[PDB]
Design a protein around this nucleic acid. Structure first.
Lengths: 64, 201, 117, 143
RNA sequence: AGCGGCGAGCGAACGGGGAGCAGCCCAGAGCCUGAAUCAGUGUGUGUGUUAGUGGAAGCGUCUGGAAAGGCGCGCGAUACAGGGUGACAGCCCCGUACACAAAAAUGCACAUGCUGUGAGCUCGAUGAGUAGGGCGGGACACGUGGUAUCCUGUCUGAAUAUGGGGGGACCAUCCUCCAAGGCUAAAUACUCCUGACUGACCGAUAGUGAACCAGUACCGUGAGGGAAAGGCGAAAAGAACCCCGGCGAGGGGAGUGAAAAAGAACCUGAAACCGUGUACGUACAAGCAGUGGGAGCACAGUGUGACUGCGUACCUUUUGUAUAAUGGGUCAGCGACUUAUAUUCUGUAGCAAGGUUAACCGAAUAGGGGAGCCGAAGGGAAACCGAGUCUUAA
């Protein structure tokens, strides 16, 4: 059978040009009054998935 | 290239791409194996532990008796029950690319003029549909193990080689990897080598 | 393609029981016992190719020591006296002389006793 | 060149790991699996993205965005495809006749991706600023 | 795409390529008025099925128990598929290719005659406790969620073509269709069963549980479970007769036969295991029984092995096992990393900015089929822009 994409991962990551994955940062949902505006400013761009995590993501996203 | 006829000595023109290519052995080995595997009638099966006739009753209890623990009379460790990874009927066909199949046939026909096993004739028919005449049609030609490849639908010639074991008649569209190799001479009528040159471009 | 394995398992077993001739009891007849008899016997054979070169050097040195002491010197002073005299005969041949040509050994001891002292 | 003379290329056929077949094979008695754990059991092995029971990375992180339903019906036309449209007129429906975009596409964009050579006529599409400066550089009119 | 403790997982459509492709009735009265239809029944034809018939050609010779083998020299072949015959047969047999055959009974078409339904035209008609709704459930990929649509247990309840449904909450447009009656071939699924035919399927611990009087013997009150067990030889020519014995059993002859060490407890006849004969060793010598050295002896190098150095099995599991931890009485046979599909990577091969087809068609591994898929472009949540783009007034 076809490999089923982990569908909850397909909403967290998007594949980029050289092959890696962009993702939204954690810690920017709620409880923001106490967070600094500098710290919240750096969680707003999308980051690239780290080296050690990438083997866990391509396992999850085979049709990315 | 050029292909000299059997006796008219007037060599018809072929494209050197089809009859003078360099031989590719890895290409021809792959298409001669995929022909051989696609001839498999993959029809066999055995019984797994599910399919062996028996009861799912555990033979003895798990503890207590000093026997080894068992849970099915149809386990594959046991006699008369269960092949472990039992066969199913399967498809042993392989995919060949068309440019790999045509590259192989262009490389076999190029090699048949190298080892002088391609002989091009201009006509190879026989009057009566009799095996006796064709048995003669190949003594003067000095052939015993041959594959005749014609362009027409000659059924007189087709029956006359149906009993001769080492003689095969084709129709220039069903020539294959293993037939162009397993015969000592390949003899092609001049109308047939026109068609075979065409389909291999 | 079912493969029966009675022919090549017989031969593989027969090859090991043939290496176990002369072994006591089930070590010559039973494959399970004779296999680890043969594996142990090859283990010992590896080890005693090392010990053979020690046991013979032990045997030569004990015979040169006896044959030196009949000529009135110890093994240590005879081997030191041969090295100061630059005589390069090994102990295999020094023991071979000591039983077969004793008068060729009393000459060797004299050539050692001289150049030592 | 007989049937008993044909060989594969060297290295085209590796053998295949046969596990659990003695000491010399280097795959006996465990099958390359090591000693007793979950991963050495038959069928054992955890599912994808399992981290132990630590919150997995695809659940540690927020979902973002939405699927557009207009990016599924748009395509990009490279300048390499402006010569294959069979007539010099690049409509939307003539890019499908040459099997360039796809039959469910309603919007195509012509982007600067390589070597427009011919008098072409793009009608009803979008072109970029580079592709407009290349179509007119070869003698093409965009409608 | 979505659904989803947005977890595990579930998973479409639209659209496209194909296989196969027929539409028709009643809610209805008239003119016309068997008017084709679609059925059944019956002769008639064509064709299978159910018995069958014909088939084409080789002899010498050596080995051998026996020739189909070897060597020699011919002949058939639209037949050299297969099987049998004293060893391996184109030419000995049965067949096979091919050419043929049916009293009678049936399958299929067709030709239909005779019966049943019943055309075509004019007009009207246009399926109500329904649709919809409230409540509760279920089905849709869709878990009530913003949620369409379908079904309906319960409670209600329209409009009746100038009207009604749907287009994913809902509304307006404007596109499309006409629910609440019904019938409908092919493409599709299957194989208890019959016929051929095939196999990189099994070869008696395998293959059906069952190659054999097998769902049997046996077991169970019962439901139920459920075995083991193939082979003389070419042909019984299966051992007349004589001996020992208990008018035994078994045996020894004689005989058959190529072979009886093929004698029926029968091809081959392994290993464990048990004997006999022979060589050597062994009755003052301590222990993984070997190994290294090594006399003596017996043979024609082999066998044995006094004395002697070193030396606590194997596996498993472990920090670690001679361990007094696990496992194994032994032999023999079987017994554990497979298969399908998807994905990624390496090798390799073909073709390269292109590469490849899937189903299907098909004189079938060909050729056709480019529906698609992947790649040549990416940024962005997206619109969008595009070799750049997002970020941000910049």
């Amino acid at each position: 059978p076809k490999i089923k994409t982990v569908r909850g991962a397909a909403k967290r990551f998007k594949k980029t040009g050289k092959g890696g994955f962009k993702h939204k940062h954690a810690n920017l949902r709620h409880i923001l009054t106490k967070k600094a505006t500098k710290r919240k400013r750096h969680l707003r761009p999308k980051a690239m998935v780290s080296k050690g995590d990438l083997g866990l993501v391509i396992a999850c996203l085979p049709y990315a | 290239m050029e292909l000299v006829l059997k006796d008219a000595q007037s060599a018809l023109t072929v494209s050197e791409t089809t009859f003078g290519r360099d031989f590719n052995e890895a290409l021809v080995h792959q298409v001669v194996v995929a022909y051989a595997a696609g001839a498999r009638q993959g029809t066999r099966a055995q019984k797994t532990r599910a399919e062996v006739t028996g009861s799912g009753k555990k033979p003895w209890r798990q503890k207590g008796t000093g026997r080894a623990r068992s849970g099915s009379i149809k386990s594959p460790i046991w006699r008369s029950g269960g092949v472990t990874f039992a066969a199913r009927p399967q498809d042993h066909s392989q995919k060949v690319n068309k440019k790999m199949y045509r590259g192989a046939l262009k490389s076999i026909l190029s090699e048949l003029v190298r080892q002088d096993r391609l002989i091009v004739v201009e006509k190879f028919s026989v009057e009566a549909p009799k095996t006796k005449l064709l048995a003669q049609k190949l003594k003067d030609m000095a052939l015993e193990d041959v594959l005749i490849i014609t362009g027409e639908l000659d059924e007189n010639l087709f029956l006359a080689a149906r009993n001769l074991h080492k003689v095969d008649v084709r129709d220039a569209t069903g020539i294959d990897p293993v037939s162009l190799i397993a015969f000592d001479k390949v003899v092609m009528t001049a109308d047939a080598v026109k068609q075979v040159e065409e389909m291999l471009a | 393609a079912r493969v029966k394995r009675g022919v090549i398992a017989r031969a593989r077993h027969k090859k090991i029981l043939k290496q176990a001739k002369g072994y006591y009891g089930a070590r010559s007849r039973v494959y399970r016992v004779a296999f680890q008899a043969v594996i142990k016997a090859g283990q010992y054979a590896y080890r005693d190719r090392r010990q053979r070169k020690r046991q013979f050097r032990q045997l030569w040195i004990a015979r040169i020591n006896a044959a030196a002491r009949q000529n009135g010197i110890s093994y240590s002073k005879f081997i030191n006296g041969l090295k100061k005299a630059s005589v390069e005969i090994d102990r295999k041949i020094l023991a071979d002389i000591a039983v077969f040509d004793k008068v060729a050994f009393t000459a060797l001891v004299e050539k050692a006793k001289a150049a030592l002292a | 060149m007989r049937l008993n003379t044909l060989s594969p290329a060297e290295g085209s056929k590796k053998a295949g790991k046969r596990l659990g077949r003695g000491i010399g094979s280097g795959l006996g008695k465990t099958g390359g699996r090591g000693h007793k754990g979950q991963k050495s059991r038959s069928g054992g092995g955890v599912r994808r993205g399992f981290e132990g029971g630590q919150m997995p990375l695809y659940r540690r992180l927020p979902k973002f965005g939405f699927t557009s339903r207009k990016a599924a019906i748009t395509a990009e036309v490279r300048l390499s495809d402006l010569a294959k449209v069979e007539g010099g007129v690049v409509d939307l429906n003539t890019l499908k006749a040459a099997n360039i975009i796809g039959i469910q596409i309603e919007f195509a964009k012509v982007i600067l991706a390589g070597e427009v050579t011919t008098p072409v006529t793009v009608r009803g599409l979008r072109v970029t600023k580079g592709a407009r400066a290349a179509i007119e550089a070869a003698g093409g009119k965009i409608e």
